[model samples]
Target: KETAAAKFERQHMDSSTSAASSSNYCNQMMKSRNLTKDRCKPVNTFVHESLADVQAVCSQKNVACKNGQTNCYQSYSTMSITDCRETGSSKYPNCAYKTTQANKHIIVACEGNPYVPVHFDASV
Candidate 1:
């Protein structure tokens, strides 16, 4: 079984990929990451930072998660990221996405032993 932290890394982390990504970045990545295996993921974000940097977010200032848990933390620094949003024309098994890249302070929810980010909350 995949751990929450491991799943987070699989879905959101892209440390080695170029920030100068193409327009098809989301199309390629959404599939490459296995997010489009069954149905199109409506919206997702990928952080272009080291795993250690993202894991360290567990120690940053605390905030409420979307579900009201106080396990979320906003990063101290803005990081490179890409937002992938499914196009209206998208369909399962043929998922299409629009990619938008930016630099923002990321928010993530962390938990468990050794404490690491397990969910991407938002970016600001």
Candidate 2:
């Protein structure tokens, strides 16, 4: 099963080509290598829900769901969730610790695409 972090990275995080468009270290490499437009594509965009929302959905009957821990840090290459404690810190502190009995991963099917958003909760 794909983790929220993985889905976020795959869709939201800029690719090397896109990152190169910015004035950053990756851009320098792109300039040196002379990257092409064909090498660039839009990253995936993901929508997330908090832990409270996840629990609410889980409480509903006849809904297929799974529960696990997830980290704020996500990787596009590996579509899976990791524990925040394992992935370390991020700007979103609420995502750093586990709370509530919520479904850590909820797949949201996008129109015309199999990739979906992993809805999880983070409550204070």
Best-fitting candidate, measured by TM-score? 1
Give the residue spans of candidate 2 off by over 4 A.
18-124
Clashes of each: 0, 5
Per-residue error (Å), model 1, residue 16: 1.0
Against the correct fold, how does model 2 do in TM-score? 0.17
Model 2 residue 10 CA deviation in Å? 0.6
In candidate 2, residue 38 scores what lDDT? 36
lDDT agreement of model 1 with the native: 0.92
Report the Cα lDDT for residue 62, model 2.
28
Number of clashes in model 2?
A: 5
| Deviation in Å, model 2, residue 110 alpha carbon | 20
Could you tell me every candidate's TM-score relative to the true structure?
A: 0.96, 0.17
lDDT of 1 by residue, 10-122 (tens): 99999987472889999999999999997898999999999998899889978888899889999998999999999999989999999999999999999899899999999
